[PDB]
Structures are given as C-alpha cells and as structure tokens.
C-alpha cells in the first residue's frame, strides 16, 4: 500500500501576537505597526522649514532690530527655539495666541509701505531699550508719534482698500509711567486711540503707572491688530498715545503653521515632522509625539502592535500530517504533500493554496483604515502658563481623541489577527477535503491527517493525485478487494 | 441508478462589494448606504420654518424699520438669507455670536412693554439714517434719551421681577463723533452707563472719535443684554449716552435653532433639513452637509458604501462546487436530479428562509435608527478670529474622521459575515442531505450524489421532505455498489 | 451492537443576548456589563474628601468669617453643597470659573503672610455687611485701605519672588455707589489700580453708580489674581480704590478637583465618586453620571448590556442535533452509551476546559481595565452664556455617542464569537470521536454512532481515552455490516 499526508511549514523562531479569543499565540511571522523612534533631525525637504534662531514670530513681524534678517520671509513650518529673546522696548499683546496663530497660518511676512500723513506731530521716536547700533531705535514696522513744539493736535487720517485682497494693520498704544511723563510726551493729560472700519471698532485708553524695569524702561506698549476687507476703509483717530503703523501685511490662506522645537535641521527628505524630529510614515500608527505636521501616522498610546502575517506555529514531534504537527523541513511553500511509497519517500508543495493564502494576507489593513491623514495647522497641545477654562477644554478634546484612536487601533489589530488565523486554518482544511474528495473509495484516513492508498500508487499516481486528474475507476476493483 | 445535485441561484448582473479578507467580491444583490443628493428645496413640514428675507435675527429683534413684519414671531428653524442688509443707525454688538445663539435657541420674539419713567430727559429720539416712512425714526425696542432744555440729570430707576420666568433686557451705549456732539446731546462731557442686578454688573464708558460714514453717521451704538432671574431686581444708573430699553423679552428653553441657507421653501414633508435642502433619512449615513437640523443621518466623507444582501455570484447536471444555477428563481437553494424518467428541479424553503431571516434587519442590531440634534456649534465662518475658531474646526474634524472610520469598518464586517453565513448555510444543507443517505449514496466530488438504487420521483420527494428510508434499499444498493 | 451519542448540557432557565446575526438568542449563562445603581453615599477612603458645608471654595479662599474653619486645608476632592451662601461684603469675580478651577486643581489653601508697607493710609477697614461678632469686619485675606487724615497718597510698593515656586496674589478694586462716597473714602475723585509683573500688567478704573442692596450695601468689589514666577517681581501702584493683599498662596500641581453633590459622606472604601455617590468599578461601563472622580468605568447611554458566558440553550438516547441534555451536570461535553449491560453517561475534560479557558478572561483582550481621570471640564451649567457653553456641551455629547457605539459593537462581536467557538468545539469533539472509529461504526444522523461490534465498558472507555484499536474488531464489524 501507500501513505499520503498533508501538512504545513513551521519555523524555529516564532512571534507571539494576540487575537480575540487568544491572549497569546505563536505565529510564523509578524510585522510591527507602531513607529516608536526618530532620528532626532528635522528634514528640509519637501517642506520649506524656516529656523527661527533667537527670534519669535511676533518679534520678527514687529521688526526687532536683531530680527531684521526675517524681512519679507516665507515658510511652510516656522520653528521656534526655546533660547529666543526680545531686545527692544517692553511690550505685551492682548490676545497673543490668536495673533500668533493668524500670522503662522498666513504663511508670509510681505510688507507694503503706505503714505500716512501726520500733521503737527514729530515722528520716528526711539528708546535706549531698542538700539540700532550706537543710536536709539524702535520697531521698524511702527511709528512712535510725539508732540511737536508744544502742541499735539487731534489726528484724523483715512486709508481705503482699493485692492482685491485683505490687509492686516498692526498698531499700538503707549502706557506712560507717570503723569509728568505723559504730559512731557503728549501734551494732553489723558490720551485716547480709536481705530475702526465700517464693520468693527476698537477704542483704547492708556493706563499710567510704575512697572518693573525692563531694559531701563518702566512703561509698556500694547499691540493691537485690524483686518480691512477689499472695498473697505480704515480710519485712525487719536489725541495721544499712538504707535502708528507704517503699512499693511498681505494675509493669505494656506497650509503653513508654527512649531516649537529644539531639534537641529539637516539635509534629508521626510514628509512628517515632529518636535522630536522627522519620522517615516510607512506605518499606520506612531508613538513619538502627538504634535505633527505633514503626512503623519496617528498617535496611539501603545508602544507596540504586532500584526500576524503567517499561520500558527506548531513544533514537530512513519510520517504524520498536519494534526498537532509541523513540518520544519518544508521551504518550497506553505502547504504540501508527503508520500511514503514502495519506491521511497518524497515531498512536494501545493501552489494554489499558498498563493490564495498569501493574496489574502497581502494588502491587509488597507481595506479598513486609510493610507495617511494630512493635517497642517491645529490647536496647541502644550502649555507653559496656567490659563483656566480654555486650556482645560483643549486638554479634554485632545485626551478624548487620543483615547478613542488607541481603542480603535487595539480592536482592529485583534480582529485582523483573528481573521488571518481563521483563513490559514480554513485553507489547510479545504486542501485536505479536496484531496479526500479526489479519492472516492480507494483511500482511508488514519486520523493523523494522512491518507492510506490500498492500491499500488506509483510516482505517476501521486503526481496525478496532486494535479487533479486521478481516476478512481482504474484502481477501484483492486482497492475494494484490498480493503475487504 | 440516479444523480442528485445541490446548487444555488445566480443572476446575469451582480454588484461588487468589499469585505475584510477580500478586496473586491461579487454578490447577487446590494444596497447603498450613503445619501449623497438633495432636491434643492426646504420642506415646511413638520417643522416650523420661518424665512427671513432681508432681515437677520438681531435686526428683527432690535426693531429695524424694514423688519417690522417679524414682530412677535415663533419658529423651529430660522433661515437667514445672504441678501439681508441693515437699514438703521450703525451699531456693533460685542460677542455677537453669543447673543445670536441664545436668541435663536429661545425660539420666540415675544416682547412685553414695561412702564419705565425717565425724569428730566426727552424720549423717543430719531436719526436721518433710520427713516420710518418720510419721518426720522429709530429701533422700535430701544429708547434714545437726550437732554431736555439745558440739563441731563442722573437717571436711577429700578424694575423688580415678580414673575416666575427669566427676563431678557436689551440696552445700548452711544459713542459720539466729537466732543461738541457729546456736549450738545448730553450736558455732561463724559457719560456712563451702569446696569446691574443683585449678582452681576456692567459699566460702560462711551468713547468719542470719528468713524467711516454709514448712511450719514460717524457715530456708533454698542448693544448689551442682561437676564433677570425671578425674584431678582434690575437697576439702571446712567449719567449720559444711554439707549434705554422699552421692556423685556420672554426667554425660554427649547429645541429651536437658526440656519444660513439660500435654498427656496416649498410644500413637502421631511424630518431632515440641510442648507442644500431637505434630504430623506432612510439611510444610516449621508454626504450632503455636516450642518443639519432634525432627525438626520450621520455625516461621512465616503461618497458610497455598498452593503451586501445576497450570496456570492458564481457563473455557471452539476452541483454547487464553483457552479451557479441561472434557472432557479423560486428560491436560493434546491436540488437537481437526473433520473430515468427525466430531469427535475425543486427549491428548498428552510435554508432560504434562514438566510433571509439572518440577512433582513442587519445594521439595526448595532447602530441606532436616527439621532435628533437641534442646536449645535457653528461650523462655517466668514472672518478669521483665532483660538476659538481653531478649536471648533479641530473638534468637527475629529468627529467626522472618527465616524467615517466607524462606518467603513462596520460595512466591511457585515459584508464578511453575510458571505460567511450564506456559505455555511449551503454547506449545512449539503451535509444534511449526505447524512440522510446513509450508505445508498456516494459523493461524486462536484457537489452531487450518485444513488445506487432505484430512486423514482417519489423517492426524490421522500429525500427532499426528510422521510427517506435507507433500510428499504440498503441491500439493493450494497449489491449494486460492490 | 452498541450506540454512542454525543451531546451538550442545557439549563432549565437561560438568558437572552444579541449577536451580529441574531436579534434574540438564548444562552445558558450571561453577565451584566453596565453599572446603573449606587448607595447614595460618598466614601472617604482612599481619597481625601473635604466637606464644604455652607462654604464655597472662593468664599473659603477669600476668608469669609463664617468660612474661617477652612483655613490652610488640603483635599483630593472638594464637595460643594447646594445650600452654600455668602455673609460678607457683596462682590463679583470677573472670569469666576477659571479662578475656581485653578484653586480646585491646586489642591491646597496654604497661605503665607508677607510684610507689605502702605505709607500714608489707614488699614484694616470693615463694613456692617461682614460681621465678626459685635464688631465689623472684612475678608481675612484682604486689606481695605482708605484715606488717613485728609490725604490719600500714591501707593507704590514692590515685593520680589526669591523662592523656587510660584506665588498667587489675590487683590480687589472697590466700586463706590456715589461720587460723595468716593470722595469721602478716597481724596481723589477718580482712583486707579495697576498691578504688574515683568511680563504682564492689569489696570482697573473703578466704576461709580447705584446697585441693588445686598446686606445693606450698594457698592461692589471685583476680585483679580496675579501669578508671580520664581525670579520675577510684583509692583502695586495705586492712588485709590485698592483692596490690598496680605500675602500669597502656594499653587501646586496635582490631581485634586471639585464636585457639586448633596450625598452624605460615610466611612467606606471606594475608588469611584459620582454626584449620586460612590459606585463599584468592577464593570467596564456605567450609566449613573457622566461626572466622575477617580478610577471609574466609562459612561454609556445604555442601561443594560448582556455578555454571553455559556452556550446556546436547546430544549431536550440521542445526540446534540437539535437536542440538549438536561441531566448533564458533570461538565459541558460528554458521551452517552447504550450497551447490552445498560445505559451510561460520561463527561469530557479537554473540550470543557478549552471552552472555559477561551471564555474566561474575555473582553479583557480589547478594552483596558480601568482609566484614571481626575480633573475635567464642567458638564452642568446654571446660567446661559453662549459660545463656550455650547462648545463644551457639543464636545461631551460627541464623546458620549462615540463610546456608547463602541460598547454596543464590542458586546455584539464578543457574543457572536463565543457562540461560534462553543459550536466549533462540539463539532471538533464529534469529528475526533468519528475519527477514532474508522470502519467499525456508522453515523446514524442525529449525532450518534452505531457500533457494529460488541463494545463493552472497557471498549467504551478505550474510545473515550483515545486508545481504541479498530483492527481487533475490524473483521467482526465488517461481517456484521455486510
Ligand atoms: C515705584 O517703585 C518701583 C519699585 O520699588 C520703582 O522702580 C525702581 O526704580 C529704581 C530707580 O528708578 C530702579 O533702580 C535702578 O535699577 C537699575 C537696574 O538694576 C538692576 O541691575 C543692576 C546691575 O545689573 C543690579 O545691581 C540691580 O540689583 C538690578 O538687578 C540700575 O542700573 C539703576 O542704577 C542707577 O543708580 C545707581 C546708584 O549708584 C547708579 O550708579 C546708576 O548709574 C543708575 O543711575 C537703578 O538702581 C529699580 O530697579 C526699580 N525697581 C524695579 C523693581 O524695577 C519706581 O521708581 C517707583 N516709582 C516712583 C515714582 O518712584
Ligand atoms: C475725519 O476723517 C474722516 C475720514 O477722512 C471724515 O469723514 C468724512 O466726512 C465727509 C463729510 O464731512 C464725508 O464726505 C461725505 O460723503 C458722502 C458719501 O459719499 C458717497 O456718496 C457720494 C454721493 O453719492 C459719492 O459721490 C461718493 O463717491 C461716495 O460714494 C457724501 O454724500 C457727502 O456729500 C456732502 O458734501 C457735498 C460737498 O459738495 C455736498 O454737495 C452734498 O450735498 C453733501 O452735503 C460728503 O461728501 C466722507 O465720506 C467721510 N469719510 C469717510 C471715510 O467716511 C471726517 O469728517 C473727519 N473729521 C474731522 C473732524 O476732521
Ligand atoms: C437709586 O435707586 C435705588 C433703587 O430704586 C435706590 O436703592 C434703594 O435705597 C433705599 C434706601 O434709600 C433702600 O431702602 C431700604 O431698604 C432696606 C431693605 O428693605 C428690606 O427690608 C424691609 C423691611 O426691613 C422690607 O420691607 C423690604 O421689602 C426689604 O425686604 C430697608 O430695610 C430700609 O429700611 C430703612 O428705612 C425704613 C423707613 O421706614 C426704616 O424704618 C428702617 O429702620 C431703615 O432705616 C430701607 O427702606 C432700597 O431697598 C433700595 N432699593 C434697592 C432695590 O436696593 C437708591 O438709593 C437710589 N439712589 C439714589 C442716589 O437715589
Ligand atoms: C522726550 C525726550 O527726549 N526726553 C528727554 C529725556 O529722556 C532726557 O533724559 C534721559 O531720558 C532717559 C529716558 O529717556 C528716553 C530713553 O528711553 O532713553 C529718551 C527718548 O528720546 C524718549 N523717547 C521718545 C520717543 O520720546 C524716551 C521716552 O521719553 C520714555 O523713555 C518712554 O517711556 O525716554 C532716562 O530717563 C535718563 O535717565 C534721562 O537722563 C532729558 C535730559 O535732559 O531730555 C529730554 O528731552
Ligand atoms: C439734536 C438735534 O436735533 N440737533 C439739530 C441738528 O441735527 C440740526 O441739523 C442737521 O443734523 C443732521 C444730524 O442730525 C441728526 C440726524 O442724524 O438726523 C438729528 C437728530 O435729531 C439727532 N438725534 C438725536 C437723538 O439728538 C442726530 C444725532 O445728533 C446724531 O445722529 C448722533 O450721532 O442727528 C445732519 O448733520 C445735518 O447735516 C444737519 O443739518 C441743526 C440744524 O440747525 O439743528 C439742531 O438742533
Ligand atoms: C468711612 C466712615 O467711617 N464713614 C462713616 C459713615 O459710614 C457713618 O455712618 C453710617 O454709615 C453706614 C455705612 O457705613 C459704613 C458701613 O458699611 O457700616 C461704615 C464703615 O466704616 C465704612 N467702611 C470703611 C472701610 O470705610 C463703610 C463704607 O464707608 C461704605 O459702606 C463702603 O461702601 O460704610 C450707613 O450708611 C449708615 O446709614 C450711616 O449712619 C457716619 C456717621 O456720622 O460716620 C462716618 O465717619
Ligand atoms: C518626544 O518628545 C516628547 C516631548 O514631550 C517626549 O515626551 C517627554 O519625555 C520626557 C522623558 O521622560 C518626559 O519627562 C516628559 O514628561 C515627556 N513629555 C510628554 C508631554 O509626554 C518623548 O519622550 C520624545 N520621544 C522620543 C522617542 O524621543
Ligand atoms: C451643499 O452645499 C455646500 C456649500 O456649503 C457644498 O460644499 C461646497 O462644495 C464645493 C464643490 O465641491 C466646494 O468647492 C466647497 O469647498 C464646499 N464647501 C464647503 C464648506 O465644504 C456641497 O458640495 C453641497 N452638497 C451637495 C450634495 O450639493
Ligand atoms: C444620578 O444623578 C443625576 C443627577 O443629574 C440624575 O440625572 C437626573 O435624573 C432625573 C430623573 O429623571 C432627570 O429628571 C434629570 O434630567 C437628570 N439630570 C441630568 C443632568 O441628566 C440620575 O438620574 C441619577 N441616577 C441615579 C441612578 O441615581
Ligand atoms: C514576514 O512578513 C514581512 C512582511 O509582512 C516580509 O517582508 C518578510 O519577508 C516575512 N518573513 C518571512 C520569514 O517570510
Ligand atoms: C435586493 O434587496 C432589496 C432589499 O434589501 C430588494 O428590495 C430587492 O428586490 C433585491 N434585489 C432583487 C434583484 O431582488
Ligand atoms: C455564570 O458565569 C459566572 C461568571 O461568568 C459564574 O460566576 C456563574 O456561576 C455562572 N453561572 C452558573 C449557573 O454556572
């Protein structure tokens, strides 16, 4: 007689993954789905990255003397270092984060100088706190108006928007330290600034008081901004304490943003940038940072997620079959035959089952979750000062999103591993059943996954069984006689 | 001898859907799950849709002269047209969005006139920028108080809340253009308005300065509001530049809202309203607009999602092993027998009924029917603001992405399970038929049985119903087989 | 001859659960996954719970005379009762919620007194609205400065931060009701208060006007705060209307928070606290409240979610084909045999243990055990505000919807897979039993085998254990069959 057995390959080094019904199970191969490291360098392609060096974006916009190399610049991502400082007149911006976000999202620092007429006042003031070389200076985009002689007239100027784009105007108000200083600079005992368009209005009254010395000055300047639509008009009215603008900024809509990072910038290519540095985006999930720019993987809390890419691994213990056994000596494929004949032993592989299993395994996780999400400008996710309600709301939103996506990742990985194991087992069972249906009554199953053939099955007989053309009528009578 | 086969129906045309393990599979029937179109019109039932032709909600509340038809109105949805304009004295409202939102959510414009006594001043001021016919006018819900003769005394009035519902008051402050104008309207050179209750207070100082001309005026008016709880009191203390109220609005709690849409309104019934128009809600997901009012499907980014409702389609006596049966139209499963009398065909009922039962009603065990949402956040903006707009955009983006992922995964899972259950049902029927035929039959290898005894039409029927007796023909089958 | 049958246990009463493909399927055992009840009490272990009684957090911080017990206190959770009240000078806090949340998250009321020097003014002012026994008083942490003699000079003091932690300063501005009161209290007809650091500055000009009487007073006080980082400095400049601070608070970072609740506090141990009371956290989900502190389950909209633990329940020698074994108590899977000597019954250990070990520890593979969340946004509001309240409500509603959907889908998937695994285990046991009997038995159609040779108790036990040798009965069985 003859013996025919079926089995599957196995490997000496297995990987442990988790499924729906198994917490631990060993497979022949698995791949990592979470990116948990970075090179620590920021790549300069294909995005346009502008190193801030020792300048913030607001100080570069205003015209700090040591930030004058940042004039008419453009960027895709602005990188702010933690060593930046300010070296001009002390100032503060009410609603600072909104202005910073607006400038960062605009994506350019194009400035157009306009002709404002201020009559009866002196222009181009300065201070010893803002030194342009040996001489006193000021912000290059602002104009410090002061009295001329002994009079400060009421200022009333206008400027229409005859262009077809929006304009952004940056102006300010000065807070003197004493009444004497106020009257020495601006003749009136109480100034007032009003800047308005046909749809909005802002009016400020300066405050007088002593403040801690910053570069020798105990006064402050408050910075405000205004946007003028096409076909609109701007009117500036004031009788003191005005830091007049010199022009407008072109404001656009685009995919620019700003990021605080201390990582160096090198020469390389990477489509995803994090404060830790650029990371590859070939994996669906990332664990490096939750602040990202470009095409980046989703942030999950888990540091490792193994996706099974092979069948279950069973070690090998008179040949046997796939029942509680593996075939470590099989390298031509996944499933195959092993026949003990009168001539001698042999081994072959089945290609259709292996190809079907691989074609089902390959390309997985591209049917449920998309390739990558492209996000450019978002909310702030790290804070250095306490604020209250809005900071709590932002933290809550971010935490909720992170938790939900982590749960989704874990559940998806478990489901896919379960289905992979199921399909491999089903493929082995289908091969066994097809072989059984081939041998109508010339065979009998021992139970170890092996068939025994009661007639003389030569090598041609085995090969015909493998191909699918074996005929039971030729050996029917002989096998029936041998069985009984 | 005879031959008995089992098979399943097939169709000339089949749809392509996707499962967990298959990129593209073909089935006999499928349904679409995403609603991606609208009629372009808004239905006026069963909700109450109020159309604001040339008026905004704030203009209709304040009493713009051309918005006088919107007095004492009620609505479920207020539709704001893009052609609305203002035709009265220029004004601006700090935190305009909050007042607009709460007025819209209140759902009514009921106004009650109160008896306010202003001693020493002159009431019912007007301006040429707000004409009520040929004569100068003003907002109908506000009172412009100026000097009488040559004096403007200090106003100090009180108004108790003896009812059991909230009161909403709307007042204002006037910002003149010149110091001369300020002195000519109000005797004092610096006005002040203090409106306060027992738990809150607001004080505003008018600011003088030139402004762009709007209908001939360089001044402006700022609008504020106050809510007085039952048992609380209101005190208005002013020195000048006060735009007094004439009464209070009855504010409420409800499910009203406001929408921006240019779609026309026609006569029909629909529970879902979108700015593109009303849409039906017989599908779980939609792709029209993420701003919705009523019982509406969920918004997803995918434009199509197909759900399988039939078996896998396999092109084509033979069995069910890679072989379809185009000639089966009375069911999904059945038998084909080739006998001496002739060929025959019948359909099974238990398996088909089980398949229909397990297929019908899917997507209802997991997801709900619909969700009713009435008032939400704003999702489209016309001006750049900064922090809050960014936060709102972030929240909406997160919600949309998560729901799209959920929809995709659910559709894939249910397609996979439908295919699996159909195949399992077919295999179960074949196994039961084998189990009936104890030793009188043999598996031919293509999904067919070859019977070794005389099995006429009555014998086929006995096999089909489940009363086949193997013992009767056992000896004959054994003699024939061996 | 003999008959061997294979079956599974059934129970007199079962539970109905839902799966992906079945609306209502009865199972032998199920468990509840949603906690929907509480004892109505708050446990004081292991968290430190501080009872606010009739004092709010702001009143305790400021130094209200009836809130003097709460001086220098520490907490993990602060409970604010609904019967709190104020008994001092009327006041208001601009941006009240942020200060309240900051103080609650700081978790301590540790106050350190500093030595300020106010030259030329009178200190320690009081009022009849804030009584300390017979005498008049004020907030214990604030200093009320007025004129001394007939002059109020320009106050300009400084205080540096030489420590290694932040400082929190609380100060105020007084709003007089009349010009005469302003002039009498402070010489200047218009005061001003400026408080600044090297990176921030605030200036408030007091308002003037009448307000509703609160405890005999018609003037108000506004409360502001300033944080000084290490290495910074504070300057207080004022010429009138200053409510001076007496020191600083130590602000920390931790896991403290604040709650509104009326439930009493008893001696018990629990890790989850809700406004309804404490709830156990042994279930993955809960339905009591969406405001929690500590290690608590997740909030879902569903009050019941049943998880299948046993097999499907089938009503009741025969096999497992549409038949149960109500008399089976030794295990889940086993054999029955009818021999010449008599009937019998046994239970298998391998299959039962495999089913138990696969089912035991389930639902822990996907979801995390517990999540610890301490301080979060506000989820209930008493007054309408507008934009921010709408955004917060939207965020919470979105989160609740998403987590409820996740819970539903997870439970359905787990139930389906449990049913499938039990069925597959039974089928595998049947297939192995058939696999032992190569040609000495024939399937009878109801899950039972007809053994065609004399199979005594030893032969049955050999079949059960896996040592059955078919050869020695092969000839006898073959002779019997044909
Ligand atoms: C209201 O109250 C505030 C605070 O009390 C007052 O503000 C102070 O004003 C004084 C002078 O107006 C400031 O003192 C000045 O400080 C300068 C910087 O000091 C720093 O740097 C030095 C050197 O690096 C350090 O040693 C020092 O510790 C500080 O860290 C000094 O450079 C100034 O020097 C002047 O005096 C010396 C005296 O010999 C001369 O040699 C110098 O040439 C120069 O003339 C000066 O000492 C003080 O810093 C301010 N305080 C704060 C906190 O900033 C307001 O003046 C007060 N308002 C009114 C109206 O009086
Ligand atoms: C501070 O600075 C601001 C801005 O610079 C000044 O505001 C200007 O005020 C003047 C009036 O003093 C405004 O001029 C008026 O404009 C009206 C609207 O113009 C539109 O309509 C006309 C006619 O349809 C069009 O031709 C024109 O292109 C506009 O589309 C005019 O209707 C007014 O006409 C009046 O004057 C003429 C003069 O002959 C008379 O014949 C008319 O009958 C009528 O009386 C007038 O021209 C101007 O628009 C304002 N500017 C802005 C930007 O708003 C402040 O006056 C100034 N304040 C101080 C104290 O200096
Ligand atoms: C601007 O307008 C406001 C409001 O119109 C004025 O505020 C009012 O000021 C008066 C004082 O002139 C307040 O009157 C006082 O009210 C106290 C509280 O009343 C409670 O208690 C009484 C009985 O105890 C109840 O009947 C009442 O309903 C309240 O529950 C009274 O206790 C005071 O009593 C004093 O006068 C009586 C006179 O008979 C004496 O018998 C008493 O012993 C005591 O001396 C007093 O009546 C009034 O409450 C204020 N209104 C509000 C709403 O607060 C401003 O004064 C005004 N400003 C200017 C500049 O005109
Ligand atoms: C307006 C002016 O020129 N005033 C002169 C005084 O400043 C001056 O002497 C010295 O002034 C110092 C502060 O002076 C400046 C400064 O910051 O250096 C001088 C700047 O010109 C002035 N800027 C403008 C635009 O006017 C600036 C400003 O007044 C304030 O600083 C704004 O807060 O002040 C410093 O106090 C020295 O200690 C002082 O000696 C006197 C000398 O006689 O002449 C004035 O004309
Ligand atoms: C107070 C008053 O009636 N003053 C008279 C002047 O108005 C008047 O001349 C004309 O004034 C025009 C601006 O006038 C109004 C307006 O806008 O129509 C008149 C309104 O009565 C007044 N409203 C109130 C409540 O006082 C309104 C108000 O002052 C401003 O709109 C506030 O910003 O102004 C316009 O300038 C014409 O060009 C002018 O001729 C003179 C005529 O002699 O008499 C004044 O008594
Ligand atoms: C400043 C002072 O002492 N003024 C005395 C008057 O208050 C006073 O008579 C009674 O004043 C009552 C209001 O008085 C107090 C109060 O609230 O009880 C007195 C407090 O000392 C004072 N607090 C401070 C820090 O100065 C407080 C304050 O002035 C305001 O209330 C703040 O809003 O007022 C009440 O009006 C009685 O009706 C009145 O008789 C007269 C008596 O001659 O003497 C003043 O010195
Ligand atoms: C990427 O950068 C982030 C910066 O936030 C790192 O996260 C910090 O890691 C340090 C190291 O222990 C902790 O002390 C901080 O608390 C972490 N911050 C936060 C917000 O989590 C992160 O470790 C970096 N990752 C890599 C791979 O470099
Ligand atoms: C419903 O109307 C909205 C308008 O708000 C349409 O959305 C715009 O569609 C155009 C064309 O694709 C885009 O260029 C715009 O960017 C869309 N606007 C926004 C805010 O996304 C929407 O396509 C309409 N839907 C249907 C079915 O007609
Ligand atoms: C736990 O406490 C909350 C307190 O809000 C209860 O929720 C309220 O329940 C009543 C009863 O019908 C409703 O009228 C309110 O509208 C509910 N409030 C909110 C904000 O939803 C809740 O029922 C309590 N649960 C238990 C188990 O005691
Ligand atoms: C394991 O799978 C990865 C991709 O899934 C493949 O690149 C690798 O060659 C596989 N390993 C083996 C030993 O086949
Ligand atoms: C496909 O299924 C729908 C219901 O799900 C049914 O109305 C339709 O008739 C089916 N298609 C065919 C061709 O029968
Ligand atoms: C049902 O299962 C629970 C645990 O899952 C167990 O404690 C209980 O005893 C079971 N019920 C029966 C009747 O065995």
Give the topology:
The structure is a homotrimer.
Chain A: E1 2-8, E2 15-17, E3 25-27, E4 30-32, E5 34-35, E6 42-45, E7 49-51, H1 57-62, E8 77-80, H2 96-106, E9 111-113, E10 121-122, E11 127-132, E12 135-137, E13 142-144, E14 146-147, E15 155-160, E16 167-175, H3 179-185, E17 192-196, E18 201-204, E19 220-228, E20 233-240, E21 242-245, E22 247-250, E23 257-260, E24 265-269, E25 272-274, E26 277-278, E27 285-286, E28 293-296, E29 298-299, E30 306-308, E31 335-340, E32 348-350, H4 351-361, E33 373-375, H5 389-438, E34 443-445, E35 450-453, H6 459-467, H7 472-483
Parallel strand pairs in A: 5-27, 6-24, 7-8, 8-23, 27-29
Antiparallel strand pairs in A: 1-31, 1-35, 2-3, 4-30, 9-22, 10-14, 11-12, 13-21, 15-20, 16-19, 16-21, 16-22, 17-18, 17-20, 25-26, 25-28, 28-33, 31-32, 34-35
Helix pairs in contact in A: 4-5
The site of a molecule of 3 linked components (NAG-GAL-SIA) has 9 residues of chain C, from strand 11.
């Amino acid at each position: 007689t003859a013996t025919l057995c079926l089995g599957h390959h196995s490997v000496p080094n297995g990987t442990i993954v988790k499924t729906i019904t198994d917490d631990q199970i060993e497979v022949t191969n698995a791949t990592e789905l979470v990116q948990n490291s970075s090179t620590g360098k920021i790549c300069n392609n294909p995005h346009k990255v502008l190193d801030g060096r020792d300048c913030t974006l607001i100080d570069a916009m205003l015209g700090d003397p040591h930030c004058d190399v940042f004039q008419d610049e453009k960027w895709d991502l602005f990188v702010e270092r933690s060593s930046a400082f300010s070296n001009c007149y002390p100032y503060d911006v009410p609603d600072y984060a909104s202005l910073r976000s607006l400038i960062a999202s605009s994506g350019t620092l194009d400035f157009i100088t306009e002709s404002f007429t201020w009559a009866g006042v002196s222009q181009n003031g300065g201070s010893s706190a803002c030194k342009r070389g040996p001489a006193n200076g000021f912000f290059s985009r602002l104009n410090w108006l002061t009295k001329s002689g002994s009079s400060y007239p009421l200022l009333n100027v206008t400027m229409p928007n005859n262009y077809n784009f929006d304009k952004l105007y940056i102006w300010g108000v000065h807070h003197p330290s004493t009444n004497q200083e106020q009257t020495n600079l601006y003749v009136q005992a109480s100034g007032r600034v009003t800047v308005s368009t046909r749809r909005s209005q802002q009016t400020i009254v300066p405050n007088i008081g002593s403040r801690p010395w910053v570069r020798g000055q105990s006064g402050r300047i408050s910075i405000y901004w205004t946007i003028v639509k096409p076909g609109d008009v701007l009117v500036i009215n004031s009788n003191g304490n005005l830091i007049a603008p010199r022009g407008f900024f072109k404001i656009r809509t685009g995919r620019s943003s700003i990021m605080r990072s201390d990582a160096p910038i090198e020469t390389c290519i990477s489509e995803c940038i994090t404060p830790n540095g650029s990371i590859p985006n070939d994996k669906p999930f990332q664990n490096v940072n939750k602040i990202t720019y470009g095409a980046c993987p989703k942030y999950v809390k888990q540091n490792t997620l193994k996706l099974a890419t092979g069948m279950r691994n069973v070690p090998e213990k008179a040949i046997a079959g796939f029942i509680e056994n593996g075939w470590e000596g099989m390298i031509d494929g996944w499933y195959g035959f092993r026949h003990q004949n009168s001539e001698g032993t042999g081994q072959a592989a089945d290609l259709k089952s292996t190809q079907a299993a691989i074609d089902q395994i390959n390309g997985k996780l591209n049917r449920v979750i998309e390739k990558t999400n492209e996000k450019f400008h978002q909310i702030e996710k790290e804070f250095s000062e306490v604020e209250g309600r809005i900071q709590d709301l932002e933290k809550y939103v971010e935490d909720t999103k992170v938790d939900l996506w982590s749960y989704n990742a874990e559940l998806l990985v478990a489901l896919e591993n379960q289905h992979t194991i199921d399909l491999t087992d089903s493929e082995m069972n289908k091969l066994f059943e097809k072989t059984r249906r081939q041998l109508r009554e010339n065979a009998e199953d021992m139970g170890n996954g092996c068939f025994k053939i009661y007639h003389k099955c030569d090598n041609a007989c085995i090969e015909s069984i493998r191909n699918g053309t074996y005929d039971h009528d030729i050996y029917r009578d002989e096998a029936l006689n041998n069985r009984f």
